[PDB]
Scaffold this active site. Structure first.
Site, PDB file in Angstrom:
ATOM      1  N   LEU A  10       0.961  -1.241   0.093  1.00 46.05           N
ATOM      2  CA  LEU A  10      -0.014   0.075  -0.052  1.00 46.05           C
ATOM      3  C   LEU A  10       1.014   1.244   0.166  1.00 46.05           C
ATOM      4  CD1 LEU A  10      -2.757  -1.274   2.580  1.00 46.05           C
ATOM      5  CD2 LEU A  10      -3.308  -0.462   0.126  1.00 46.05           C
ATOM      6  N   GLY A  11       2.069   1.273   0.583  1.00 49.60           N
ATOM      7  CA  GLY A  11       2.876   2.400   0.749  1.00 49.60           C
ATOM      8  C   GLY A  11       4.230   1.948   1.361  1.00 49.60           C
ATOM      9  N   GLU A  12       5.193   2.769   1.350  1.00 48.53           N
ATOM     10  CA  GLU A  12       6.360   2.653   2.118  1.00 48.53           C
ATOM     11  C   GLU A  12       7.009   4.008   2.763  1.00 48.53           C
ATOM     12  OE1 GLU A  12       8.638   1.069  -1.455  1.00 48.53           O
ATOM     13  OE2 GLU A  12       9.430  -0.498  -0.243  1.00 48.53           O
ATOM     14  N   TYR A  15      11.117   4.294   7.750  1.00 47.62           N
ATOM     15  CA  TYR A  15      10.996   3.726   9.042  1.00 47.62           C
ATOM     16  C   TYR A  15      10.042   2.303   9.106  1.00 47.62           C
ATOM     17  N   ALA A  16       9.149   2.315   8.101  1.00 50.59           N
ATOM     18  CA  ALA A  16       8.339   1.176   7.772  1.00 50.59           C
ATOM     19  C   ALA A  16       7.573   1.321   6.557  1.00 50.59           C
ATOM     20  CB  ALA A  16       7.213   1.195   9.069  1.00 50.59           C
ATOM     21  N   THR A  17       7.090  -0.193   6.249  1.00 49.44           N
ATOM     22  CA  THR A  17       6.465  -0.370   5.141  1.00 49.44           C
ATOM     23  C   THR A  17       4.948  -0.922   5.204  1.00 49.44           C
ATOM     24  OG1 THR A  17       6.496  -1.745   2.732  1.00 49.44           O
ATOM     25  CG2 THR A  17       8.235  -2.258   4.631  1.00 49.44           C
ATOM     26  N   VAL A  18       4.088  -0.727   4.431  1.00 46.58           N
ATOM     27  CA  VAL A  18       2.581  -1.323   4.720  1.00 46.58           C
ATOM     28  C   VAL A  18       2.164  -1.956   3.746  1.00 46.58           C
ATOM     29  CG1 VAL A  18       1.986   0.806   6.373  1.00 46.58           C
ATOM     30  CG2 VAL A  18       1.547   0.998   4.142  1.00 46.58           C
ATOM     31  N   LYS A  33       1.263  -3.046   9.198  1.00 42.13           N
ATOM     32  CA  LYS A  33       2.504  -2.063   9.180  1.00 42.13           C
ATOM     33  C   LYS A  33       3.756  -2.769   9.674  1.00 42.13           C
ATOM     34  CE  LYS A  33       4.046   2.123  11.003  1.00 42.13           C
ATOM     35  NZ  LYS A  33       3.704   3.162  12.100  1.00 42.13           N
ATOM     36  N   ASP A 119       4.302  14.687   9.273  1.00 37.92           N
ATOM     37  CA  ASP A 119       4.247  15.079   7.954  1.00 37.92           C
ATOM     38  C   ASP A 119       2.915  14.770   7.573  1.00 37.92           C
ATOM     39  OD1 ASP A 119       5.154  13.363   4.971  1.00 37.92           O
ATOM     40  OD2 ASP A 119       5.523  15.490   5.308  1.00 37.92           O
TER      41      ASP A 119
HETATM   42  O1  LIG Z   1      -5.916   0.837   5.835  1.00 42.88           O
HETATM   43  C1  LIG Z   1      -4.712   1.368   6.172  1.00 42.88           C
HETATM   44  N1  LIG Z   1      -4.585   1.571   7.495  1.00 42.88           N
HETATM   45  C2  LIG Z   1      -3.315   1.941   8.023  1.00 42.88           C
HETATM   46  C3  LIG Z   1      -2.764   1.961   9.255  1.00 42.88           C
HETATM   47  C4  LIG Z   1      -1.447   2.497   9.264  1.00 42.88           C
HETATM   48  C5  LIG Z   1      -0.666   2.702   8.011  1.00 42.88           C
HETATM   49  C6  LIG Z   1      -1.387   2.713   6.853  1.00 42.88           C
HETATM   50  C7  LIG Z   1      -2.774   2.179   6.628  1.00 42.88           C
HETATM   51  C8  LIG Z   1      -3.747   2.119   5.775  1.00 42.88           C
HETATM   52  C9  LIG Z   1      -3.841   2.344   4.369  1.00 42.88           C
HETATM   53  N2  LIG Z   1      -4.805   2.210   3.559  1.00 42.88           N
HETATM   54  C10 LIG Z   1      -4.438   2.496   2.392  1.00 42.88           C
HETATM   55  C11 LIG Z   1      -5.084   2.569   1.270  1.00 42.88           C
HETATM   56  C12 LIG Z   1      -4.541   3.099  -0.324  1.00 42.88           C
HETATM   57  C13 LIG Z   1      -3.530   3.586  -0.205  1.00 42.88           C
HETATM   58  C14 LIG Z   1      -2.714   3.508   1.044  1.00 42.88           C
HETATM   59  C15 LIG Z   1      -3.254   3.213   2.422  1.00 42.88           C
HETATM   60  C16 LIG Z   1      -2.781   3.114   3.594  1.00 42.88           C
HETATM   61  N3  LIG Z   1      -1.359   3.357   4.080  1.00 42.88           N
HETATM   62  O2  LIG Z   1      -0.532   3.953   3.162  1.00 42.88           O
HETATM   63  C17 LIG Z   1      -0.029   5.185   3.669  1.00 42.88           C
HETATM   64  C18 LIG Z   1       1.348   4.953   3.377  1.00 42.88           C
HETATM   65  C19 LIG Z   1       1.989   6.783   3.509  1.00 42.88           C
HETATM   66  O3  LIG Z   1       3.576   6.476   3.504  1.00 42.88           O
HETATM   67  C20 LIG Z   1       1.421   7.571   2.808  1.00 42.88           C
HETATM   68  O4  LIG Z   1       1.629   7.267   1.260  1.00 42.88           O
END
Ligand SMILES: O=C1Nc2ccccc2/C1=C1/Nc2ccccc2/C1=N\OCC[C@@H](O)CO
Length: 294
Positions: A10-12, A15-18, A33, A119
């Site tokens: 979902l993202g990076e 400090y962490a990757t999701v 996470k 941020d």
């Molecule tokens: O549903 C979610 N519960 C969470 C709990 C902690 C961190 C992220 C998320 C999360 C996310 N749900 C979604 C759905 C679409 C795109 C990104 C996304 C999420 N996290 O991505 C956030 C990463 C940050 O670096 C911003 O890009």
């Protein structure tokens, strides 16, 4: 990784990757996470506190591997940027207001709990099918991307307070109302220029002490006269522009609080019953409050 199925990224972060996840037991979707780690000190605000608010992602489980620590959260399918882009950057005005109230709730709770957003940006704000907005557990930090940075911080400010988050609220409010970033600067120097073109170049009257700032004097800014915010965001009303103004103050100390932001006349249409709701109940619980189709 025995009870959950790791899905797509979902993202990076540094400090962490999701990752998107699913339970092998309930079949419900989760967010995994993955905290990027001889010994590693874990400072996670979701672990060292319990941010139990309807507009903060809820932590459900903790997983230990010899190589990582995985925090299992509730899942939301789209982030604010993804949501904007999906409706062609034209969010229904009633929804902008519902999204804004929600963001102000989560933040006003963090601040109460002495938590800061290092941020704050659209990608850290998530949206579900009910129309709920929640703060992702990414970039949250205890009080101890240049687009959403305040002018005082850029011009050398030693104060890292709850007020920083308020400038970001103003920036995101504009991005929701217009579908475009308010100050998309590439350098400290360009960002300041982009800000002064909208708000005006500071004078000893609007910002006491500026002319005494060494870094401000060296940049030779033209004396820009303030441009009416309502002219920049026509979809907004007089109260919408007034809340924006009160949010985008040069000096953090003058920026309206998240608590007071919620008592502003822009939100009158929502009613008195939303102010009496406990931290844990969704704003949608009220018959009076409902998401408009895009
Ligand atoms: O549903 C979610 N519960 C969470 C709990 C902690 C961190 C992220 C998320 C999360 C996310 N749900 C979604 C759905 C679409 C795109 C990104 C996304 C999420 N996290 O991505 C956030 C990463 C940050 O670096 C911003 O890009």
């Amino acid at each position: 990784m025995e009870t959950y199925i790791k899905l797509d990224k979902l993202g990076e972060g540094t400090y962490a990757t999701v990752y998107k996840g699913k339970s092998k037991l309930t079949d419900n979707l989760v967010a995994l996470k993955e905290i990027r780690l001889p010994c590693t000190a874990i400072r996670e605000v979701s672990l060292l506190k319990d941010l139990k608010h309807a507009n903060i992602v809820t932590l459900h489980d903790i997983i230990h591997t010899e190589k990582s620590l995985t925090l299992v959260f509730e899942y939301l399918d789209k982030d604010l940027k993804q949501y904007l882009d999906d409706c062609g950057n034209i969010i229904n005005m009633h929804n902008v207001k519902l999204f804004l109230f929600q963001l102000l709730r989560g933040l006003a709770y963090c601040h109460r709990q002495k938590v800061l957003h290092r941020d704050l940006k659209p990608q850290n704000l998530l949206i579900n099918e009910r129309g709920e907005l929640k703060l992702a557990d990414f970039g949250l930090a205890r009080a101890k991307t240049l687009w959403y940075r305040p002018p005082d911080i850029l011009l050398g400010s030693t104060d890292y307070s709850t007020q920083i988050d308020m400038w970001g609220v103003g920036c995101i409010f504009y991005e929701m109302a217009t579908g475009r970033p308010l100050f998309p600067g590439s350098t400290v120097e360009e960002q300041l220029h982009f800000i002064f073109r909208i708000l005006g170049t500071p004078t000893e009257e609007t910002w006491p002490g500026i002319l005494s700032n060494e870094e401000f004097k060296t940049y030779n800014y033209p004396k820009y006269r303030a441009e009416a915010l309502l002219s920049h965001a026509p979809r907004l009303d007089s109260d919408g522009a007034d809340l924006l103004t009160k949010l985008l103050q040069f000096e953090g100390r003058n920026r309206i609080s998240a608590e007071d932001a919620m008592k502003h006349p822009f939100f009158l249409s929502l009613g008195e019953r939303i102010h009496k709701l406990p931290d844990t109940t969704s704003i949608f619980a009220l018959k009076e409050i409902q998401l408009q189709k895009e």
